[PDB]
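Hey, weird one. I pasted the De novo kemp eliminase KE07 round 5 sequence into the form twice and got a warning about non-standard characters only the second time. First submission, copied straight from the form history:
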Amino acid sequence: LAKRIDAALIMKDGRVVKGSNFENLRDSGDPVELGKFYSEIGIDELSFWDITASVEKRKTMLELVEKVAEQIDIPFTVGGGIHDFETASELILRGADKVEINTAAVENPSLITQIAQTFGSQAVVVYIAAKRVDGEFMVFTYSGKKNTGILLRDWVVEVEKRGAGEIVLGSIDRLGTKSGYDTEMIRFVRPLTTLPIIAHRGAGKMEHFLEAFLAGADAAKADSVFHFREIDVRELKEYLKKHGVNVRLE
């Protein structure tokens, strides 16, 4: 299939955390308006990641999904502390196409299967945050705070076995950096799974997307490099097409 370009939007109390540099927008911190704009300039799928600390979180995420679904016509994922089936189910029913789970899946891998039983594997995205520790790739949970001691190699295989649809491979070794995706990590995981692999963390320039696809990623996700306009999405797609990557153009 075509390689996919995804934008992730970090959200808190209904606002895009740190906003965006698109002066054309009425509200460059409105996740709905920013997502719509991305969907019109060539992003293929959107991820919305909520860090609303608790009490209002569940209603906030539901209202976000509802507003996004009304306005955008490309697939989107919602994530951020989805811990059980009923939470996932209400978000999908309210409009999300996929849910993106990490810590709760590691703690109870049957959650992957439970969501997929009702909504299909394609509705379940597992975000794997991994880091090198003593020469092994290890899985981390709780926003990078906890080394689970679970090997990336074992967790990728289990995630597919449990019925996930896609894996987002986030390199903690690239968090905050702009040096490139962790192509070694992507190459490590590629032979272990038939699932789509979505690279995350490390992108700083268009060439980094080419590198990630050469490494075997099926999609590449980024956030601040788009929001602060270090990379233009349309230029990126034109660049990838020029160098032989199958991406969707308009």
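That's the output from the first submission. The warning seems to come from a hidden character in my clipboard, not from the data itself. The first strand starts at residue 4 and ends at 12.
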